[PDB]
RNA sequence: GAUGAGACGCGUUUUAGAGCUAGAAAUAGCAAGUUAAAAUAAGGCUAGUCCGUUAUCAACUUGAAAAAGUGGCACCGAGUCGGUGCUU
DNA sequence: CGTGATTCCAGCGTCTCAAAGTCTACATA
DNA sequence: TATGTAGACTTATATTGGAATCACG
């Protein structure tokens, strides 16, 4: 069996796979083809790509699920309201509710009278005339005290409940006083009454504007205080204003109180918190705080409710009535003005629904903004519309009762109006008095966020727990739901578990055990040196215990001075001590210990370990919740242990935040031999004092083994669940799953022989304004005038050379001279650290100079000469933030620090390793699926080595050796990327085996940086273990080791391993082999078929029409009378071979056609296909001939023409256009697809090659035409493209190449799309017929497409 | 970063808002114009203040199904694989 | 009168939860 | 009066199929 390797490239839209061998040549095999087709043997290369639709997020599903939940909860609330009214309404009217529930049906299908409210035309007309809107009726029922018909009361209550407004506002503000100025004046009056000796002059203070301004509460407080000279924000009046604004002011200082008078109107405890305050200073100040609360309510009402009428109790219904009156008056005035001045526009404005006039604003789809935009010029053109123009500029011209800006309405206003109606109508209806609080509860009820769906399971989003098994109603939710228990489950489920131990609950941030762990972990590294001691010593167990007892348990924060003096001098009698570790202040602290010591006032209780767990259960309660009532309910279990004062003080104490390590990770697991936990080791570890990092990484302890055994595949019940649990986007996880299945299929393909290596690469998944700001700040800090002489826009800064020029302030970075913009093309861009040490494209890693030769010494950093010349200039640029600290250090690396071997190792590590961890998870999954056997030492046998590569290495490999990629040519680039990843990974691990530790999971481990770095100049790689003095990693591939000086160090034609001596690269035939691989016209492109799901149809209720395409919104709602949905998305088509009656002849004519199965009908079709098809009209269906065709089903026609089944009546182009490599390279070079990076001589050679191969352009177009004539069959589009190409033959080569790059989408795989050749627009050619594929060859393709099943549909039947 | 929940305001739609006069009618002219109720993905069985737009995957065989099983190799070339040898 | 070509058109805004960043003014040494 | 700290305000586009329309030989 020949050894082979598998390379894969992972993306969010594609998975590229490639199989390589010992020659780095893609193999080729014969694959059997099943089916009735004549062909039984085919040939396919082992490199290809798999294309699937990107994974879609679940946010849309979450929104369209919460929407259904809300629209089923509102209906239930309305039903409850009806249930309250059932008996009395039935006494008054027996068919009122049936009318209201059958109002939507037409008169023909109605079982009752067509007039809902009264059942007769006369009373309906009278009601509508008397009450044009529901708001008139609501206001009448609020203010008027006369008995009214029960139907009107029910209608008002229903309209109030069904639209109750938001619940954002906190607290209770049922009183409707909202005039800011009047309540501010009353507060000032009360303050002056209480404080006569110290009055406040509020004259000239615009309280309304200041308090109601759209600004922060603190900002408004400061503004208001600024208008009071002798008053401060922290004063009593300032604290009252802050409380009114929603802050939390402390009245302790104002009244010299011992108790901290913290009062917030949002907190539920305020009712007590105020009274307690009134207990100390008396009840004389109560009226002041009540005036403050009234002012707060007025401020909260602010702009949303702005009507000012004293008589009306309802402050919102009168607002709607005033709006309606303004609308009517403005309509009459505008109608008169239009009839007088512009009679020709009257019909267009008041009758054309298609326009954005009044007709379209009322009956059409025109919104308020569109109507304003359409009518502003007409009002400005006419006379007498000054008030109308003012209203338009104030967004109150011809407004409707319902609008877009009623979302600010707090539910308190609707609650108050409903309360007023109930108070005004309960005097005539006993049941309203009996059920007033029930209706108020219905209106105010709202399922708390921490309770969740009231579903007792039977779902995958419910966590609520029940106290009694009965129906939950808004009136009994407190006693039928275990709210306290359910809140704990909520908090726990949406809080991440310990990363090290997925099954262990994490600890609170302020937990006592967690604080002990943090202190000890840090304490296990402190040392002390004195006169008598020869060497600094680790703090022993007894020493650490004494330090904790004397310092950490007596001071919240322990400073280094405190450690030196209070312990070493007081106990150890040490006069001079040096402390290792942190200096000045210790970051860790036992804040919780001192906090509990202050409350309970029982030090022995805290120091007793027996209470430890209990204390934890307290701290958890202080962290788990924030509601004081729930905290009290939980802490009630420990009420016997502490006094009531202590219990209340604990209730007032609250916390937040979580740690990162679990309790079991601290004191749960124990080492096998020692029998000590992590905390036990931290308290005493002899003279080693190993910390947590050392403890969990020590091979001599079981902690590491236990962590490895626990964390490994904690979700490893299967492959789907393990990938799903991984943290990452849905698209990337779908790509991971497809890559794993591709690996399994490839392993099956090659005779069940595991490949030697698996290389994986995962693709990497405004700014001009930022650049402008940075350049402006740097120039203004530097004081230069370069912007005055050279204006520039933000977009122009996207050019690298111009951006670097402005960053350097028009000065050469290596020479103390100026640079010219118009000469930038003759200048040079040079890397500070050369390519020999680090291949990169970072802006900081680049410098704009007149000539690179001026860099002085080039072997190791720019010479000390340039540093001495312009280190001050570099520092000046650094201070202006024009260059970064890293760039400055690299520029001054000549003598800031000698060229470091550590820096070279860091460069190598940065180039090699992968910063992301998701790639590590993918590698672990692949390794666990491949490596399953163990050796004699019970260690894993790593038959398959999994390598992870970054895209930078492959991109640089592509750029160095003229192997270019153009993503918009075809989809082969994914497969080519996978192949190059495989080649690069295999070659890199064969050249330098020691890199396996960096590139493989587990087993192999690093040793140091000394053995990696070689000696100066060329060294013997084979003899000396030294591998690389220069810090490049891929320069062995190329034929010349370049340098910043331009010096050349040629390499042997054949590169081989130093020790083993095996040939790893033959530059004379391996590059040719790669070229031949990339030139292969046959590549396995298979689109992953995926049955479509989602919306039943487009979500837009279309108006009634005479067409069968409409889909009914309800079973009995005929689309011809009530409209319905349109465009049902087809889940998958079904090929049916049956007969249908031929109309009048009544003959069963044999037919074969594609029937689109919609998502709506999918379940019915799958339940019984025969009955569904017979209902559709087909007779004598061949059940065994039924073929399921999901979306993207592949069909082949004559001359290799391929199509994909996009739907039942539309097709997509199914062929790939394999362009020759030379044309691809010419298009890449000529169009400047990427930046023109490289030596100027190389750029000149590339330009010469482009100019000498201009004819390619024509040839390319010719090829495309032929491909169209072979695959596209779009005569009009092809002719237009040819005419456009012949039209712009005089255009520059770069522009023509760029247009051709975006001209390639004519035959791109997938759905057709319109494109632009220069200014010519070519629309997509759509294949609206699927008849031909009924006689083509259906090709079912595997995930890799190496196995294919070809069925001749024409041969069937 | 990945989820998950509780709320709102809309939007859309049919019917209700006797639209009128002069026309034989078509048509003309005139008046009014904001609101309401209902559904908001077909509905299902588990009858829930639940759930239905994310995740799954080619075909066949075995199977209800979670799933397993089902295809030679080398060689030269290369327009989306063509042929040769070997195995067979 | 099928048939190719042309055109439009698609449901959408807000808040809360729960998170840290950062000032800040009353304790605190 | 120079810090510690507890609190509290602040921050956190196009795609593509369907349907109609529209010419049209």
UniProtKB/Swiss-Prot annotation:
Region PAM-interacting domain (PI): start-end pairs: 1090-1357
Consequence recorded when altering residue 977 to A: Only cleaves 1 DNA strand, probably the noncomplementary strand. Processes guide RNAs correctly. In vivo, loss of Cas9-mediated CRISPR interference in plasmid transformation
Organism: Streptococcus pyogenes serotype M1
Cofactor(s) annotated in UniProt: Mg(2+)
Name of the protein: CRISPR-associated endonuclease Cas9/Csn1
Highest taxon, organism lineage: Bacteria
CDD domains per UniProt: Csn1
An annotated Gene Ontology molecular function: RNA binding
Self-association state and partner proteins as the record states: Monomer. Binds crRNA and tracrRNA.
Role description: CRISPR (clustered regularly interspaced short palindromic repeat) is an adaptive immune system that provides protection against mobile genetic elements (viruses, transposable elements and conjugative plasmids). CRISPR clusters contain spacers, sequences complementary to antecedent mobile elements, and target invading nucleic acids. CRISPR clusters are transcribed and processed into CRISPR RNA (crRNA). In type II CRISPR systems correct processing of pre-crRNA requires a trans-encoded small RNA (tracrRNA), endogenous ribonuclease 3 (rnc) and this protein.
Uses in industry and biotechnology: Coexpression of Cas9 with an artificial single guide RNA (sgRNA) which fuses the crRNA with the tracrRNA in human cells has shown it is possible to target and modify DNA sequences of interest. Cas9 plus the 2 sgRNAs have also been expressed individually in human and mouse cells to achieve DNA targeting; cleavage efficiencies of the artificial sgRNA were lower that those for systems with the 2 sgRNAs expressed separately. Microinjection of Cas9-encoding mRNA and a synthetic sgRNA into zebrafish embryos induces targeted mutations.
């Amino acid at each position: 069996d020949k050894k082979y390797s598998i390379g894969l490239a992972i993306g969010t839209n594609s998975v590229g796979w490639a199989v390589i061998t010992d020659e780095y040549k893609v193999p080729s095999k014969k694959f059997k083809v099943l089916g009735n087709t004549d062909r039984h043997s085919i040939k396919k290369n082992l490199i290809g790509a798999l294309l699937f639709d990107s994974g879609e997020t679940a946010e849309a599903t979450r929104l369209k699920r919460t929407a259904r939940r809300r629209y089923t909860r509102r209906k239930n609330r309305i039903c409850y309201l009806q249930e309250i009214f059932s008996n009395e309404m039935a006494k008054v009217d027996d068919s009122f509710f049936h009318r209201l529930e059958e109002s939507f049906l037409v008169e023909e299908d109605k079982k009752h009278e067509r007039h809902p409210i009264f059942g007769n035309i006369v009373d309906e007309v009278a009601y509508h005339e008397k009450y044009p809107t529901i708001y008139h009726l609501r206001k009448k029922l609020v203010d008027s005290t006369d008995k009214a018909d029960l139907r009107l009361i029910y209608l008002a209550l229903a309209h109030m409940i069904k639209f109750r407004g938001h619940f954002l506002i906190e607290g209770d503000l049922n009183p409707d006083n909202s005039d800011v100025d009047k309540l501010f004046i009353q507060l000032v009056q009360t303050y002056n009454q209480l404080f006569e000796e110290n009055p406040i002059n509020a004259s000239g203070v615009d309280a309304k504007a200041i308090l109601s301004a759209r600004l922060s509460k603190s900002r408004r407080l400061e503004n208001l205080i600024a208008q009071l000279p002798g008053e401060k924000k922290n004063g009593l009046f300032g604290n009252l204003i802050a409380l009114s604004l929603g802050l939390t002011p402390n009245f302790k200082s104002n009244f010299d109180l011992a108790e901290d008078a913290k009062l917030q109107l949002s907190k539920d405890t305020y009712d007590d918190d105020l009274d307690n305050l009134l207990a100390q200073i008396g009840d004389q100040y109560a009226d002041l705080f009540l005036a403050a609360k009234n002012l707060s309510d007025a401020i909260l009402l602010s702009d949303i409710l702005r009507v000012n009428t004293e008589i009306t109790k309802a402050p919102l219904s009168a607002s709607m009535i005033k709006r309606y009156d303004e609308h009517h008056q403005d309509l009459t005035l505008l109608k008169a003005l239009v009839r007088q001045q512009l009679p020709e526009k009257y019909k267009e404005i008041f009758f054309d629904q298609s326009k954005n006039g009044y007709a379209g604003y009322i009956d059409g789809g025109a919104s308020q903004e569109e109507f304003y935009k359409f009518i502003k010029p007409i009002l400005e053109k006419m006379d007498g519309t000054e008030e109308l123009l003012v209203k338009l500029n104030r967004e109150d011209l011809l407004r409707k009762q319902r609008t877009f800006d009623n979302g600010s309405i707090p539910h308190q206003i609707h609650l108050g109006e409903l309360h007023a109606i109930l108070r005004r109508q309960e005097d005539f209806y006993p049941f309203l008095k009996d059920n007033r609080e029930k209706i108020e509860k219905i209106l105010t009820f709202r399922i708390p966020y921490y309770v969740g769906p009231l579903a007792r399971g039977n779902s995958r989003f419910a966590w609520m727990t029940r106290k009694s098994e009965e129906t939950i109603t808004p009136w009994n939710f407190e006693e039928v739901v275990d709210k306290g228990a359910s809140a704990q489950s909520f908090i726990e489920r949406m809080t991440n578990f310990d990363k090290n131990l997925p099954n262990e609950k994490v600890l609170p941030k302020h937990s006592l055990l967690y604080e002990y762990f943090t202190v000890y972990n840090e304490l296990t590294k402190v040392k002390y040196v004195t006169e008598g001691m020869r060497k600094p010593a680790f703090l022993s167990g007894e020493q650490k215990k004494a330090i904790v007892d004397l310092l950490f348990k007596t001071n919240r924060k322990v400073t280094v001075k405190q450690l030196k003096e209070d312990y070493f001098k007081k106990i150890e009698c040490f006069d001079s001590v040096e402390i290792s570790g942190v200096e000045d202040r210790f970051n860790a602290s036992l804040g919780t210990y001192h906090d509990l010591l202050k409350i309970i006032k029982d030090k022995d209780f805290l120091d007793n370990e027996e209470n430890e767990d209990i204390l934890e259960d307290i701290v958890l309660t202080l962290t788990l919740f924030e509601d004081r009532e729930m905290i009290e309910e939980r802490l009630k279990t420990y009420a016997h242990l502490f006094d009531d004062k202590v219990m209340k003080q604990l209730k007032r104490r609250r916390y937040t935040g979580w740690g990162r390590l679990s309790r079991k990770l601290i004191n749960g697991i124990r080492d096998k031999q020692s029998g000590k936990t992590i905390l036990d080791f931290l308290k005493s570890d002899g003279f080693a004092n190993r910390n947590f990092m050392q403890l969990i990484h020590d091979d001599s302890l079981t902690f590491k083994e236990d962590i490895q055994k626990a964390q490994v595949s904690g979700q490893g019940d299967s492959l789907h669940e393990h990938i799903a649990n991984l943290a990452g986007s849905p698209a990337i996880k779908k790509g991971i799953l497809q890559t794993v299945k591709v690996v399994d299929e490839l392993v099956k393909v090659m005779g069940r022989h595991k490949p030697e290596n698996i290389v994986i690469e995962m693709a990497r998944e405004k700014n001009s304004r930022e650049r402008m700001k940075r350049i402006e700040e740097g120039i203004k800090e530097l004081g230069s005038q370069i912007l005055k002489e050279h204006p520039v826009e933000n977009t122009q800064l996207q050019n690298e050379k111009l951006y670097l020029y402005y960053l350097q302030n028009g000065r050469d970075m290596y020479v103390d001279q100026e640079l010219d913009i118009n000469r930038l093309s003759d200048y040079d861009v040079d890397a500070i650290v050369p390519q020999s040490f680090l291949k990169d494209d970072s802006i900081d890693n680049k410098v704009l100079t007149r000539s690179d030769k001026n860099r002085g010494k080039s072997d190791n950093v720019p010479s000390e000469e340039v540093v001495k010349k312009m280190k001050n200039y570099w520092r000046q640029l650094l201070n202006a933030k024009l260059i970064t600290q890293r760039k400055f250090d690299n520029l001054t690396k000549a003598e800031r620090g000698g060229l470091s071997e550590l820096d070279k190792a860091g460069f190598i590590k940065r180039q090699l390793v992968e910063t992301r961890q998701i790639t590590k998870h993918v590698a672990q999954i692949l390794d666990s699926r491949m490596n399953t056997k163990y050796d004699e030492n019970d260690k894993l046998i790593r038959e398959v080595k999994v390598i992870t590569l970054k895209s930078k290495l492959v991109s640089d490999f592509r750029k160095d050796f003229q192997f270019y990629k153009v993503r918009e040519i075809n989809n082969y680039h994914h497969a080519h990327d996978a192949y190059l990843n495989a080649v690069v990974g295999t070659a890199l691990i064969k050249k330098y085996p020691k890199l396996e530790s960096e590139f493989v999971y587990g087993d192999y481990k690093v040793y140091d940086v000394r053995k990696m770095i070689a000696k100066s100049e060329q060294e013997i790689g084979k003899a000396t273990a030294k591998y690389f003095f220069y810090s490049n990693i891929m320069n062995f591939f190329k034929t010349e080791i370049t340098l910043a000086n331009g010096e050349i160090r040629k390499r042997p034609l054949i590169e081989t391993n130093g020790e083993t001596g095996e040939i790893v690269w033959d530059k004379g035939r391996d590059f040719a082999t790669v070229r031949k691989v990339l030139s292969m016209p046959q590549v396995n492109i298979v689109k992953k078929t995926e049955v479509q799901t989602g919306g039943f149809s487009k979500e837009s209720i279309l108006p009634k029409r005479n067409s069968d395409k409409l889909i009914a919104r309800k079973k009995d709602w005929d689309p011809k009378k009530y409209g319905g949905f349109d465009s049902p998305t087809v889940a998958y088509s079904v090929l049916v071979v049956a007969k249908v009656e031929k109309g009048k002849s009544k003959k069963l004519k044999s037919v074969k056609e594609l029937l689109g199965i919609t998502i709506m009908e999918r379940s019915s079709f799958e339940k019984n296909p025969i009955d569904f098809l017979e209902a559709k009209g087909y007779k004598e269906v061949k059940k065994d001939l039924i073929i399921k065709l999901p979306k993207y089903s592949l069909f082949e026609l004559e001359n290799g023409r391929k199509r994909m089944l996009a739907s039942a009546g539309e097709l997509q182009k199914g062929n790939e256009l394999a362009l020759p490599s030379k044309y691809v390279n010419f298009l890449y070079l000529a169009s400047h697809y990427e930046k023109l990076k490289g030596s100027p001589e190389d750029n000149e050679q590339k330009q010469l090659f482009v100019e000498q191969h201009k004819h390619y352009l024509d040839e390319i177009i010719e090829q495309i035409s032929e491909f169209s004539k072979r695959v596209i069959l779009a005569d009009a589009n092809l002719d237009k493209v040819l005419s456009a190409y012949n039209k712009h033959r005089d255009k520059p080569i770069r522009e023509q190449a760029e247009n051709i790059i975006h001209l390639f989408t004519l035959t791109n795989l997938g759905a057709p799309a319109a494109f632009k050749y220069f200014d010519t627009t070519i629309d997509r050619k759509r294949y609206t017929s699927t008849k031909e594929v009924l006689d083509a060859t259906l090709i079912h393709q595997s995930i890799t497409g190496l196995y294919e099943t070809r069925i001749d549909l024409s041969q069937l039947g």
